[PDB]
Amino acid sequence: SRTNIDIDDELAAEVMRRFGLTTKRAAVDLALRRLVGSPLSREFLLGLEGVGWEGDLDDLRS
Amino acid sequence: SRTNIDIDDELAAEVMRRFGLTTKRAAVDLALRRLVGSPLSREFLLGLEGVGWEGDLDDLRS
Amino acid sequence: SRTNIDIDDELAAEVMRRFGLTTKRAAVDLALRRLVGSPLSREFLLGLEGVGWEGDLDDLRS
Amino acid sequence: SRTNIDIDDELAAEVMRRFGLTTKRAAVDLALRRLVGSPLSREFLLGLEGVGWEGDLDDLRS
Amino acid sequence: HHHHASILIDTSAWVEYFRATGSIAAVEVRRLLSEEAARIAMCEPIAMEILSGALDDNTHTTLERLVNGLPSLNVDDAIDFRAAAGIYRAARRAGETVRSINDCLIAALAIRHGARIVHRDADFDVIARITNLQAASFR
Amino acid sequence: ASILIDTSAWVEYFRATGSIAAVEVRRLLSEEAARIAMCEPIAMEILSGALDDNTHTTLERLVNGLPSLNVDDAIDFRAAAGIYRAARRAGETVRSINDCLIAALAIRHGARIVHRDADFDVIARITNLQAASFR
Amino acid sequence: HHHASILIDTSAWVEYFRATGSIAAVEVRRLLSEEAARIAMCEPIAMEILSGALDDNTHTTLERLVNGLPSLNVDDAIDFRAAAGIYRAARRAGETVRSINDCLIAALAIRHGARIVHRDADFDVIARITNLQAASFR
Amino acid sequence: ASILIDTSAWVEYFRATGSIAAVEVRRLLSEEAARIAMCEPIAMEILSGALDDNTHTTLERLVNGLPSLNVDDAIDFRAAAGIYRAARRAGETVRSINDCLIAALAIRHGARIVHRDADFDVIARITNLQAASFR
């Protein structure tokens, strides 16, 4: 994961301007999370069936 | 600019798979650029062809 | 705060006459306030009272 | 003409920022001219009657 | 606090004055210039129209003095073009006819600034039927 | 400090109801116009009830002519959710989840809200939202 | 050459969460099993989901889900006005819309080129008057 | 360098006429989307002819989602006027004064304009306007 790559400095800063980020680790992280998310394993996702949701969707909508 | 930062191998690989890129650096670049690029998707933009326009440009101009 | 500047006398006089102000300072302050004030005029803003609204806020908010 | 005058610092600064002006004097002149324009005598205004206008407003509008 | 009831003279009235037609519009313009000069405003769409139809370069120069001299009501493109569009579409929906979309722009800017329009163009009659534009016709 | 007028108060003004909220909106327009702010959730509400074409253009002018307090996609929805949950915990109800959103954005911007909706009364009791009710 | 994201609406999500066994829940399960890579979240949906999470552990779990999925952003230069437009159109059509946030969701979906999987009549209405791609599982 | 697509080209695209202009618009959308810009005079034209509600909403979305090249009140109208005058003196005909405004805007921004309107052909002879005709 320690990875040696060319990252456009301007671009990383440009993202730092736009999103009020104070890093590059912040910009890259965001960039990646937005586009493909974070690792969600198959078992996790399947395990959500029956996890429960006690709120009322009618209250939130109508 | 050449930078060594921890990038999760698997997220980058996912990016590569989804966008047909051959390197992690390219993937990361793409992810950064999407963050500060156009808010209108290709799909939306191409979907406008044939949407219609019922006014008369002659009235507005000629 | 206080400063020494050139002000076109005639212009200042005109402002004073048109807005019924007694001093150059007042004239300058009013001009500066109008310059950075709302793009929506007082007249337009007060004209909105009784413009109407056809919606039902209860439906929008439940 | 030159005069000593109290000008709200903040407003002046704002004006300088918005219009990319580098002096308080310039800011103040701009503000005054927004209010009353530049001197047009009654004589000049009345002298415009019959000056001529050989264009066609139908061309410009329809 | 400090009210000012600006009067925006439309190109349509201006032209009458410039040509000295003796029409009620020209006379009204004259009156305005003699009695209400301090209330008269210009805007850049009107200015563009005025300059555009000045064929003689000397006359054009003179006109430039006028349009540069009068206090200006600005066009703010964060607001006024959309408002014009809205006006125009409403007119269309009403089955009304609008000769010039720049009349809708002018009216939009007048409404924003709280100015009344003196004119002789039916477009402004139309627009005052669908918005709260203060307009006075002199045909 | 920006003054964010809520839809609840705005509507009063638009319909010239004469209620205290309408009068306060009028006052705001008269005396503090340069401090009045808009946000896009409020804008959406206002335009969604402007079914008359003329009303719509007019209120669109209003929305476009006021400074905007942005919605931050990264946090504001989360904040709103948090607020909602807190309200529930406090044994209160919120009729509209978008009031939570609006309040979140106000808190982020340091803006104060002028309103006549009990939701903002609730939210000021579980956050540091600066809200003034004219109900 | 990337395929269209699939935005699962709160309406379908809830079924899945509750293990109701309805066609919606089954569809969501299928999506999770067979097309996980195409699933997207947006912040309005996220807000809804977290707001109905009463139990704290459950809430925590759902936060993981919501931060774990790729996100389709809300851009307030565009999406709120578009939602308003959608709403007004619906109203003029004589249609009823129970949640203005469904118009927002649809607006963002259209912008992003995403299709919606749902069980809420609002999305049916919206697909009638826009080019929203919506699939009802009710 | 920004690419302003003129209303004339846009309309071809919206109506799916299959003209060279429509196809070029499509190409632009496909391959050079990041360089496409809008301006408010074009926007006004586009929205004025969008009479259907859905059409108006979606073209509103388009106009709001493209980067805007500003109208500078102090300069652009004067520039347009000048352009018009020059055209008339050249013995040319200009159908729309707002085409002169748009071209002024384009020249000020250093933007090129993609169109199918003879007005821009006229204006590129008498100015430094970067215009691409697909008539």
Numbering used by the authors:
A (entry chain H), B (entry chain K), C (entry chain U), D (entry chain D): 2 to 63
E (entry chain C): -4 to 134
F (entry chain E), H (entry chain A): 0 to 134
G (entry chain G): -3 to 134
Relevant lines from the article:
Virulence-associated proteins B and C (VapBC) are the most abundant Type II TA system present in prokaryotes. VapC, the toxin, inhibits protein translation by cleaving either transfer RNA (tRNA) or the sarcin-ricin loop (SRL) of 23S ribosomal RNA (rRNA) or messenger RNA (mRNA), and this activity is neutralized by their cognate VapB antitoxins. Here, we demonstrate that the VapBC11 TA module is essential for Mtb to establish infection in guinea pigs. In the present study, we also show that VapC11 cleaves tRNA-LeuCAG in a Mg2+-dependent manner.
